[PDB]
Amino acid sequence: QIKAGLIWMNGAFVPQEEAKTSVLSHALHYGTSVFEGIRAYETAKGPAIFRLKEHVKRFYNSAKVLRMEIPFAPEELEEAIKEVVRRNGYRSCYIRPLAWMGAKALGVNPLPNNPAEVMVAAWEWVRKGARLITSSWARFPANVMPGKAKVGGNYVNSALAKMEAVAAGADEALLLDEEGYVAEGSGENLFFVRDGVIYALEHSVNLEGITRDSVIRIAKDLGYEVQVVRATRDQLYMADEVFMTGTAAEVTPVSMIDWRPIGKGTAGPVALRLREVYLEAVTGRRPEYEGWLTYVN
Amino acid sequence: IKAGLIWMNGAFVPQEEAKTSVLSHALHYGTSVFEGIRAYETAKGPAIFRLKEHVKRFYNSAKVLRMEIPFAPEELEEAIKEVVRRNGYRSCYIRPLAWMGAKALGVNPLPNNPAEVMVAAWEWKGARLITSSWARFPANVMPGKAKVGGNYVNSALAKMEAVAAGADEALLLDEEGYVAEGSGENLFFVRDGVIYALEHSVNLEGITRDSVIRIAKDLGYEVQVVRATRDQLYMADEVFMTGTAAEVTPVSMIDWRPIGKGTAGPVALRLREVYLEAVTGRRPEYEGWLTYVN
Amino acid sequence: QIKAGLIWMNGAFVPQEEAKTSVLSHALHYGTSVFEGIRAYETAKGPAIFRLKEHVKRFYNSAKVLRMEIPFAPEELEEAIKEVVRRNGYRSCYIRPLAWMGAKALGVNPLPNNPAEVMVAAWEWVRKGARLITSSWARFPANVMPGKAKVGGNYVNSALAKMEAVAAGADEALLLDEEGYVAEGSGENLFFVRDGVIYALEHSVNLEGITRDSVIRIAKDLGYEVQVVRATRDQLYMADEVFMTGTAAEVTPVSMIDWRPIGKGTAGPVALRLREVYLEAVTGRRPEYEGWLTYVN
Amino acid sequence: IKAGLIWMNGAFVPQEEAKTSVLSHALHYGTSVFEGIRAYETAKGPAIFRLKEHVKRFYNSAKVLRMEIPFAPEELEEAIKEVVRRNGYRSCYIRPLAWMGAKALGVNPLPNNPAEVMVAAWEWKGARLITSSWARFPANVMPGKAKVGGNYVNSALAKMEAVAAGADEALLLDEEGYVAEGSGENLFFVRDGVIYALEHSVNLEGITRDSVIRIAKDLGYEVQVVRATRDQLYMADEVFMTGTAAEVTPVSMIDWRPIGKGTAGPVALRLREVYLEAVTGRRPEYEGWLTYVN
Amino acid sequence: IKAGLIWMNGAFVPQEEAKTSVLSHALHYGTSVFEGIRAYETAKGPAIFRLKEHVKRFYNSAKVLRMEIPFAPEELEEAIKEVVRRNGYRSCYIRPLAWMGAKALGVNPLPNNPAEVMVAAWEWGAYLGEEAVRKGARLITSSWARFPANVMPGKAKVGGNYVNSALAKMEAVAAGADEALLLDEEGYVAEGSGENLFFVRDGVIYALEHSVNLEGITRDSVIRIAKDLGYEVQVVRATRDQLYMADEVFMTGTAAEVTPVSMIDWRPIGKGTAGPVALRLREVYLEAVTGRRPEYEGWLTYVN
Amino acid sequence: IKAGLIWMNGAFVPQEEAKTSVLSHALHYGTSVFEGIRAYETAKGPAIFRLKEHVKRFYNSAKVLRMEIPFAPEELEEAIKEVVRRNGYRSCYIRPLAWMGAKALGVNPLPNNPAEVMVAAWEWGAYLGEEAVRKGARLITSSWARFPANVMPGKAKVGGNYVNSALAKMEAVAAGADEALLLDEEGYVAEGSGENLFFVRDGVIYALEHSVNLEGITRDSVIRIAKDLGYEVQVVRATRDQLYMADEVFMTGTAAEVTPVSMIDWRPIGKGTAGPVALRLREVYLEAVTGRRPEYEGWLTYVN
Ligand SMILES: *Cc1c(COP(=O)(O)O)cnc(C)c1O
Ligand SMILES: *Cc1c(COP(=O)(O)O)cnc(C)c1O
Ligand SMILES: *Cc1c(COP(=O)(O)O)cnc(C)c1O
Numbered sequence A, C: 001q002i003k004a005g006l007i008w009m010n011g012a013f014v015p016q017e018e019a020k021t022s023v024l025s026h027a028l029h030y031g032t033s034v035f036e037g038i039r040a041y042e043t044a045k046g047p048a049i050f051r052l053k054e055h056v057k058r059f060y061n062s063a064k065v066l067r068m069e070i071p072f073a074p075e076e077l078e079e080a081i082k083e084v085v086r087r088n089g090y091r092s093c094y095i096r097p098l099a100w101m102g103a104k105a106l107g108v109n110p111l112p113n114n115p116a117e118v119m120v121a122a123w124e125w126v127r128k129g130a131r132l133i134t135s136s137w138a139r140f141p142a143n144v145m146p147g148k149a150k151v152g153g154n155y156v157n158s159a160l161a162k163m164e165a166v167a168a169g170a171d172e173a174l175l176l177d178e179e180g181y182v183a184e185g186s187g188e189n190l191f192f193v194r195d196g197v198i199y200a201l202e203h204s205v206n207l208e209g210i211t212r213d214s215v216i217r218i219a220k221d222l223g224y225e226v227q228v229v230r231a232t233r234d235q236l237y238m239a240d241e242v243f244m245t246g247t248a249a250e251v252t253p254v255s256m257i258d259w260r261p262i263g264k265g266t267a268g269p270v271a272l273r274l275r276e277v278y279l280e281a282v283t284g285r286r287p288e289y290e291g292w293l294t295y296v297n
Numbered sequence B, D: 001i002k003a004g005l006i007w008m009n010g011a012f013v014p015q016e017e018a019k020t021s022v023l024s025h026a027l028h029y030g031t032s033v034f035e036g037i038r039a040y041e042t043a044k045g046p047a048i049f050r051l052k053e054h055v056k057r058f059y060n061s062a063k064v065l066r067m068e069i070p071f072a073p074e075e076l077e078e079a080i081k082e083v084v085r086r087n088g089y090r091s092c093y094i095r096p097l098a099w100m101g102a103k104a105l106g107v108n109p110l111p112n113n114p115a116e117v118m119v120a121a122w123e124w125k126g127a128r129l130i131t132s133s134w135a136r137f138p139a140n141v142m143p144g145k146a147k148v149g150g151n152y153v154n155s156a157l158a159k160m161e162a163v164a165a166g167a168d169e170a171l172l173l174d175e176e177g178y179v180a181e182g183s184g185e186n187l188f189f190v191r192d193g194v195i196y197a198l199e200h201s202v203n204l205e206g207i208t209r210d211s212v213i214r215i216a217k218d219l220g221y222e223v224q225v226v227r228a229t230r231d232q233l234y235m236a237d238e239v240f241m242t243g244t245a246a247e248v249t250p251v252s253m254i255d256w257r258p259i260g261k262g263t264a265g266p267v268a269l270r271l272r273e274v275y276l277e278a279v280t281g282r283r284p285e286y287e288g289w290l291t292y293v294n
Numbered sequence E, F: 001i002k003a004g005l006i007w008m009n010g011a012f013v014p015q016e017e018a019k020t021s022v023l024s025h026a027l028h029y030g031t032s033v034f035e036g037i038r039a040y041e042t043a044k045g046p047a048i049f050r051l052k053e054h055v056k057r058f059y060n061s062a063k064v065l066r067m068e069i070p071f072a073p074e075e076l077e078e079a080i081k082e083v084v085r086r087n088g089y090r091s092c093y094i095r096p097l098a099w100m101g102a103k104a105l106g107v108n109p110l111p112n113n114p115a116e117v118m119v120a121a122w123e124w125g126a127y128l129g130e131e132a133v134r135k136g137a138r139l140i141t142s143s144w145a146r147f148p149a150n151v152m153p154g155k156a157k158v159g160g161n162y163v164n165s166a167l168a169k170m171e172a173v174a175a176g177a178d179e180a181l182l183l184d185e186e187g188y189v190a191e192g193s194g195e196n197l198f199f200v201r202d203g204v205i206y207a208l209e210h211s212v213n214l215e216g217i218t219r220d221s222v223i224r225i226a227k228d229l230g231y232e233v234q235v236v237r238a239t240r241d242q243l244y245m246a247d248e249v250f251m252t253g254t255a256a257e258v259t260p261v262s263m264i265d266w267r268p269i270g271k272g273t274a275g276p277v278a279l280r281l282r283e284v285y286l287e288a289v290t291g292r293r294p295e296y297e298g299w300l301t302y303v304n
């Protein structure tokens, strides 16, 4: 099982064993929950949470999409997130805030169930490159599921694609949109490099990644030209490099897609430089990016 | 919810004890499957409607997610009969649920198998619809033939929109623009004496829809299955929807445009009444669809 | 100009010259009108209007799509339609009822303009086959324009396709839907015949033609098997026959599509038989179909 | 409508005489083109805003329908100035219209050329939007870059739906599910200090949109052009729309979800005010956009 | 390929001489049409299955490309019978091909008419045994969608179309499956890389609508056989999950005959092995093509 | 076609010997890849335009099909230079082609690797004069949509892809136009049957986004030239009516060079004849490919 330890449950910390909810909870039946993925990294000055405010802002934004009411002020959630790290003595960990519709009723409409229940849990936490396979499941259109939010139900699509990719022998899935263009990974944003230029994929139906945002800023600071474009699978096949970004995935080089090697078939220099600066940033070794860190101690 | 005793992975427990970890995969990623089953009071006690058909779909939904249900269908069927008996229910709604637990939180749910399972139950002018701005998911985006938890975010968004607009229910179109179904009901319309059931397209294959078609044919109605547009519904003599919870519900208006006379029509009302007679054990011809708990 | 003569204008007949409306009429700016196409044919017992009630029903149905209020009872319109034939001494003519939003205001919302203005005008009115060309304009999706109604604005799509077809040297345009399947002509429903079976195209985004309905009934009465299906352009290219139906088009055989001959390259026997029975029906020579006729005298 | 003297194919006539045959092609098939132009009162009299740009689009719209306008642009420009002068208007809305007449009623409009033309004019918290169930037409279905009469059946359906639902305006998506525009307004949103104008996609290339972008850049704002989804708007700090009739209108709520603070935002209000200063002749930098009638 | 004597635009020549210019339009632009026909040995000699239906489709495919075949259908039919006789074949696969030649290489193929035509045939190296048939084929849904009806002519066997089939088949094999299941652009099931699909549920046999698929002659044959056996057959549009929950799934094609499908996307179909309906249909189909069914003799053309 | 000596998998042979089996996978299934390269005569001998960029795309196209080209890029580059020299050509069109051979005819082409390769070249019969260029090309929007990105590989020059181009070109010519303008399935402008599109409005040059189109080398060259001349260039998605109202429209391609478009769907573009921007870009492009522009010499590979 997950070694989470003390979990913040609607205002107070309780042992993991006591962090449970009714099986009649609306979210367990209809996917009506929202969550975030946040990381803390150890630094010379103790644990530092990466871009906490941006993650909390998105958490509340996701709730708004479902017209879900979070009965806590953003500042309270931010304090709870800092405390879940402190109270458990974590240094490098993954933090998972979750807001879900409770068991007041089970009609499909979740409004009668407001306000949402909320909890925050956490647990302690390249050159070869990842191998991807294009999925037979398309990322949902923008008027089918809210792709800019981390809504629980959305991940049935990610789960189906990820299972398919792993079953096929790949590390991750690459999903296309319904029109046939590249969208993103089951849980990562995509980038590719061609003739020295870095191409970030347009937001289309993808989540607006905070890691993606961070990597674009880093890339420009390093002097690279960055263009935002729509891309096809074969534009990726012919790229010099391809890489993915995400809180859990950090910056991961992609060496092969659909059994077709990308460039030299191993992680490229651009993706590796971006990954290195990103890791230096999250560990408090880049003064120019200290604004992105929230020190727990 | 007044559920009372709930069957939890093999044994009944008080409602307050029917809880699961907040780290359960399904609570974060919508990886659960469920069913909606009804029991109606008859002269011979409570009767569950088309129990085996619902249980079959439950396991079918699980297969779509490659979810393993650690119980034989026969065991779940017994649990469903028992949730009615042990709680002393007569007319009730039964909700079986299988969900991925808290073994891990990677998006891939396979490491979380087998699924946890529970069965709960609780005693149990025409509708006005508005076409939704949310389209029912394409067949390669979400599994529309299964009752997978995550699917219902789409239904929830559409239902909230309809209610906020002043309607009773939402009518969702598919991405191409054709009529799909309600947030939780299959659709039918009637024109010049003929009953038109909508093709399955991206919709759930409703058991009530199936029941209604059989009843309609038995009553002598001509039934055709077609793809339909919103304006084919606007000009229909009648429109109605079906579902376990919705039974057979007449639709009197869509997008503020009256359907036919603007009130519940004769065909929808007749099908609803005959359906009620079937589920309450008044029609010998349909007794095969009933499972008497006593 | 059109030789219409006496035109029924909101309750009373007036000379064609007096049948005018403000240039500030909502329908002249935003396509907010509905119309019908009805024909009267000369018979041994005088002029007979074909399926009048079905056409009037559709007229009111089209108005409902626009939430347009027609300030006359269907029976009044039916009488006006009979009178436009009588008063002008017509025998074989085309009848055009039209309801349009007036000049009360020019906001895009037409509701403030209700009730609609209404008028009814009329004017006196194969083996080679028609040549069609597939259009570069797609028939509108069912959630873009109301394709089951004869709404004025809809015909911008038909006009663009028809102009294109004529410019290319064809007689009529064949429109596909956005997905690439055959839809219908700019103003006609489509049918094809293969191995003795008659295939009527599904309604999809097309208008539910009354001529199409009539031809299907006639076909079945003649003993032909009729199937309703979705079709692709190449299914038509390989058909034994292809034909179109419409009030103005009656039953018209199609001998060529996209410069590819259909079957023998001339009208086929099936389309010709259906056309003949249809013409016998509308001229009062088929006792079994007399229910479809409304004799003006 | 209090239009007064209307220019009809070359000469002004009383409003009551400005009529056309009910057998006019455009009244049956939507084959007309129009423009929306405004005149604002300035210290130097009425000034028409971006007259030549609007006249150019008028002729461009006609080309899409292969419609022949039997007058030179210069003649129409003079007619537009005169409809303001002869009626003694100061702040007014000007509506030029070209339509296919009554020569014939075959669907093909070519036999009806040249088009008839008229020019009429009349004195002239944040908006709440709801996403429409009607999608703006694909680029190969209706000519979305032209103000063709028939196109507005789509706008009318969406607007009626929005108003019936309790909103002020409709937000239409394209068939693929992305945001397109309002029933008669282009859309913008603001996030983290950056102004985002939506790409042209299937929308009309608004002159107000163009004006707003120029003003925003001149004021020092960063402006990006992107494709957007409904939930990108839900999470924006601000959303606003532009159009000749709508000027610059802030949007405080979409689908009952508040945008930012739930009230008109600073950027939208500032752009609206500077735009008003430009059209009323208070900003020398934008005088090139004005045509003084006197 | 051991084809032997090949019919080349009117006359048979040794395989070594059956070559065409590398400047042929079809080698650069996919402008060819072909057919897949089979001759099955019987006690009365080889019998070609539904020859006229295949030849009709061959000419229909050519019409889609506005390709002119400079031979009458009867001439091609005789050549098809002769390729079997002249090579002394019993059972064999027959491949007629019409392609645009090397007159020019502008994308427009009209200047290249008339098309060159050839008919070749060769023997099978091996056949699947009942054990393999019963285990059933494993399919995986492809990331490549079958082309929309206004993108490529899906009702014709046009060479270029098969780039789509090739991409899907390679993907399926690489993923460990036997065949690919392609969806259409809208997300519904279309067909395999070279087979039509069917599924069985609650006693009813469901054939998929034609949609963007090729109108298979094997599909047609199976439907006729199923109806003759007393089965109810319905034609519908289907989703991947309707197949996941079917009692049985099977595919048809000249090369594939009737092949049961036991798993799709690692999800077992029904019992996880071939079912009784597909196995029965396959048996009757094989009895028909090998001349053991008097009622279906009209479908056979005996070479001798 | 008068090609003369053709390079066939490693060595030059007379055209008559440059033939391949009619059982070649690519002749039946469109499994080939090719390039369009040009050599322009200069006072210093023939100069091949952007040779390495074309060769890179050739190998990239092969990768999409998982096709193995058994030659190093440098070998192909030498063969391309030699086909010009050995035939004594000055200006000429060069056509490299890699195709799947006749090892087997299962739809999966992997068993057929490695691919066969050839390089042929031939001279132009005629060129358009300034009069024709100024009149401009007339386009008509096609009823055939360019394939979605998950249907056919639109970034590669794969043989099968051109069935779509062939159908569109035939349709356009039959309608009386010079070329077809294809839209994508969603209704937006894609490209011509074999040319990328550009339009000019209010002084700005608009290149179309790549969408489902091929990333043209001529398109790339024109954008560089336009920027060097001082023009503002933007890349956007466009609709047919945005082109109808453009001041100018033009298309690019190796064979098409820079061709002004004066009419689309019988609607005149701007003045109804070629405009000054397209004519200027065409002139500078021609100066570049014929070695009259020192700043662009890096794009040329002199055979002598
Ligand atoms: C969370 C997530 C990402 C990555 O976003 P980050 O903010 O960089 O963590 C990408 N795609 C999906 C679908 C996600 O849920
Ligand atoms: C459960 C459900 C129905 C109704 O199906 P029944 O089997 O009749 O209860 C219809 N649509 C959806 C989306 C459903 O989930
Ligand atoms: C009127 C019309 C038809 C033909 O319908 P009928 O009822 O047979 O006259 C077909 N298509 C369109 C678009 C039409 O408007």
Ligand SMILES: *Cc1c(COP(=O)(O)O)cnc(C)c1O
Binding pocket: D036, D147, D181, D182, D183, D184, D185, D186, D203, D204, D205, D206, D207, D208, D209, D242, D243, D244, D245
């Ligand atoms: C007229 C119009 C606009 C606004 O354009 P402006 O040039 O700014 O007046 C926006 N959308 C549509 C559909 C329009 O017709």
Ligand SMILES: *Cc1c(COP(=O)(O)O)cnc(C)c1O
Binding pocket: E036, E157, E191, E192, E193, E194, E195, E196, E214, E215, E216, E217, E218, E219, E252, E253, E254, E255
């Ligand atoms: C040839 C083919 C089939 C099978 O058709 P049969 O006539 O049964 O051989 C199925 N699908 C495709 C794409 C084909 O090319």
Ligand SMILES: *Cc1c(COP(=O)(O)O)cnc(C)c1O
Binding pocket: F036, F157, F191, F192, F193, F194, F195, F196, F214, F215, F216, F217, F218, F219, F252, F253, F254, F255
């Ligand atoms: C070859 C080609 C082009 C032109 O590209 P260039 O590199 O400029 O020759 C454009 N479109 C298609 C479809 C092509 O095949």
Ligand SMILES: CC(C)CCC(=O)O
Binding pocket: A036, A037, A038, A158, A186, A187, A188, A246, A247, A248, A249, B107
């Ligand atoms: C796809 C999501 C479950 C992963 C969030 C993260 O990157 O942390």
Ligand SMILES: CC(C)CCC(=O)O
Binding pocket: A108, B035, B036, B037, B183, B184, B185, B243, B244, B245, B246
């Ligand atoms: C809306 C759905 C969750 C209701 C299921 C049922 O009809 O029982």
Ligand SMILES: CC(C)CCC(=O)O
Binding pocket: C036, C037, C038, C158, C186, C187, C188, C246, C247, C248, C249, D107
């Ligand atoms: C397309 C419509 C204008 C024609 C109606 C009719 O067939 O009479």
Ligand SMILES: CC(C)CCC(=O)O
Binding pocket: C108, D035, D036, D037, D183, D184, D185, D243, D244, D245, D246
């Ligand atoms: C809704 C549109 C008709 C309004 C045009 C304008 O902004 O003037």
Ligand SMILES: CC(C)CCC(=O)O
Binding pocket: E035, E036, E037, E165, E193, E194, E195, E253, E254, E255, E256, F107
């Ligand atoms: C897909 C095709 C190449 C196969 C033809 C056949 O079944 O014989």
Ligand SMILES: CC(C)CCC(=O)O
Binding pocket: E107, F035, F036, F037, F165, F193, F194, F195, F253, F254, F255, F256
């Ligand atoms: C479309 C392609 C066949 C043309 C390549 C070229 O422009 O040379």
